[PDB]
């Protein structure tokens, strides 16, 4: 008969051995860039919150004082 | 796992200077192995006294220039990366001989 030892046709295909850790592009300064933005947006809206908060404010106070007396 | 570590700020924080040794020094405590390797004084047995066909496949084993310990966990790696190739390279070459000696 034949022998069954096992070795197929050659080469099995290729094989990757070596190293490989890509792809973050995202990163210049420009991660500073988005970041600080984010801050320059809550900076603004929570300036006008602020603002309108402190209109009500003086709106509740005129409460108090027309009730005074 | 590489990027499961390597480049931690932890991990390596953790472990950076700890641990050197002075390669001459090495020779004299008598390691071989890992530690040889990632410091300095590039020595193998795979390579200098082959022992058996493990002459024949190609590979190349790494080292470190700061021997700090993390260069000997890197190396460790990439002796698993090598161990690959050879699994590979060993896989291509398998002759279908016989298994014990005739004697």
Redesign the interface.
């Given at each position: 008969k034949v022998k069954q030892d096992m070795p197929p046709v050659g080469g099995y295909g290729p094989i990757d051995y070596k190293r490989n850790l890509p792809r973050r592009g995202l990163s210049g300064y420009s991660m500073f860039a988005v970041g600080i933005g984010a801050l320059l947006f809550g900076y603004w809206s929570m300036m006008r919150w602020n603002r309108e908060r402190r209109r009500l404010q003086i709106e509740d106070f005129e409460a108090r004082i027309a009730l005074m007396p | 796992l590489?990027?499961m570590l390597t480049n931690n700020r932890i991990w390596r924080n953790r472990t950076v200077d700890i641990g050197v040794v002075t390669a001459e020094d090495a020779l004299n405590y008598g390691f071989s192995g890992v530690m040889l390797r990632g410091s300095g004084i590039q020595w193998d047995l795979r390579k200098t006294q082959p022992y058996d066909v493990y002459d024949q496949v190609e590979f190349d084993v790494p080292i470190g220039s700061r021997g700090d310990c993390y260069d000997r966990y890197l190396c460790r790696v990439?002796e698993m990366?090598?161990s690959?190739?050879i699994i590979?390279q060993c896989?291509?070459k398998?002759?279908?001989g016989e298994i014990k000696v005739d004697d």
């Open positions: - | 590489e990027e990439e990366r090598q690959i190739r590979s896989l291509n398998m002759p279908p």
